[PDB]
Amino acid sequence: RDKPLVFFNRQPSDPGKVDMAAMNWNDKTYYVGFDAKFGGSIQGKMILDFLASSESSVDRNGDGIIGYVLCIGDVGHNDSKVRTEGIRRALGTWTGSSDPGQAKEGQAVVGGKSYKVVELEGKAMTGTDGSTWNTNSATESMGSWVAKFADKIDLVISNNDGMAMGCLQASNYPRGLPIFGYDANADAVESVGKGELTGTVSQNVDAQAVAVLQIIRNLLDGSSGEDVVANGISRPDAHGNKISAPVQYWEDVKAIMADNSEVTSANWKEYTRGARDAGVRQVSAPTKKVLLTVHNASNDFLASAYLPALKHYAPLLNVDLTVVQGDGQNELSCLDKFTNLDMFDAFAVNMVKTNSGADYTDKLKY
Ligand SMILES: [Ca+2]
């Protein structure tokens, strides 16, 4: 068939190269995701810009060193390693390894002056039960870090929000000690608003949600070429709607990729629980039917963040959204519910196996 087909959240590929056979299903096929590989770089940037804007006061003991402690989530997990590498490279403490204990003396500018940077300690947070990204171990480690390093700690850095909020639960957390996380969880963004957590990082789920719906509307409304991926996304559409977060377009892979955004005192209100893009308003237009797929009904992120975003923005773009969800293990749990395709004007597919692009395009021929 020749209807719009927007893959999202999981990019068609070998589980490593993009499945360009799927992407070229037709000239109305796209992918929507986010700039994942650069996530660590953005956390690092946030931390560097914070220090750059700081006075000499952030150097608590005034030894000309910016000392930090690092919460590692999982030494074998890609997201942990990317975020560790991201902040270590940014601070110049990177040696080629994301492992704990593997850092060198670094450098960073504070108030126009060069400071040494030392990773006082980086530690994997693991529970007694073996569970990783462990919040309780973070709380305990933070408490011990205060006792051991005391005024040497100038900031705390964490692979995620969960562990960072764990650190803030330490009964002896030094008052006003800067600390940074990652994920932009609700409680984390709230903390940023209260001036406790210093920063975190968002993948902009809302931007991704709107982009899926906007690409579809642009296509069904008769747009072609640059308009399809720009209107309502990186510039206002005919109605004035426009995604607020920055978004990229990767042409060779037909991918609309939201930036990773840092979340600080400067913009936390835009990322709090239930916050929605004020740049996307109700449109007066004919209703269009969209069948949307979810690879796992039990996935917390898709269930708690992505789907609710989709359901909020869809009626504003006059999209009648029908959602079907799989179990998370077999591709059939989605394909079976991927029927009645003659009833819909467009399709958004989130498959469990990235290489299963051909299974869906086959059903689009009947
Ligand atoms: Ca110091």
Residue numbers in the entry: 11 to 25, 28 to 378
Show passages lifted from the paper.
In this report, we found that TpMglB-2, the product of gene tp0684, is very likely the D-glucose-binding protein of an ABC transporter dedicated to the import of this vital molecule. The overall fold of TpMglB-2 resembles those of LBPs (sometimes called “Periplasmic Binding Proteins”) that serve as receptors for nutrients and cofactors in bacterial ABC transporters. LBPs generally have two structurally similar lobes that are attached by a hinge region. TpMglB-2 has an unconventional topology for an LBP, but retains the hallmarks of ligand binding and ligand-induced conformational change that are common to this family of proteins.
Purified, recombinant TpMglB-2 readily formed crystals that diffracted X-rays to a minimum Bragg spacing of 2.05 Å. The final model after refinement featured excellent geometry, and 366 of the 387 residues present in the construct were visible in the electron-density maps. The large cleft region is solvent-accessible, and thus this structure of TpMglB-2 appears to be in the “open” conformation. The first is a calcium ion, which is located at the far end of the lobe, about 30 Å distant from the cleft. This cation is coordinated by atoms from four side chains of TpMglB-2: D71, N73, D75, and D166. The Ca2+ appears to stabilize a loop on the C lobe while simultaneously adhering it to the main body of the domain. The second small molecule is located in the interlobe cleft in association with residues of the C lobe; it is BIS-TRIS, which had been included in both the crystallization medium and the cryoprotection buffer at a concentration of 100 mM. Hydrogen bonds to hydroxyl groups on the buffer molecule are provided by the side chains of residues D91, R95, N172, and D195, and an additional van der Waals interaction is made by the side chain of H89. Although this site likely overlaps with the ligand-binding site (see below), the fact that TpMglB-2 adopts an open conformation with this small molecule bound suggests that its binding is adventitious. Comparisons of the structures of TpMglB-2 and EcMglB also reveal a stark difference in the proteins: their topologies are circularly permuted. The hinges of Type I/Cluster B LBPs are usually made up of three regions of irregular secondary structure representing points where the primary structure crosses over from one lobe to the other. The permutation noted above in TpMglB-2 necessitates a fourth cross-over; this region of the protein (residues 284–288) is close to the canonical hinge.
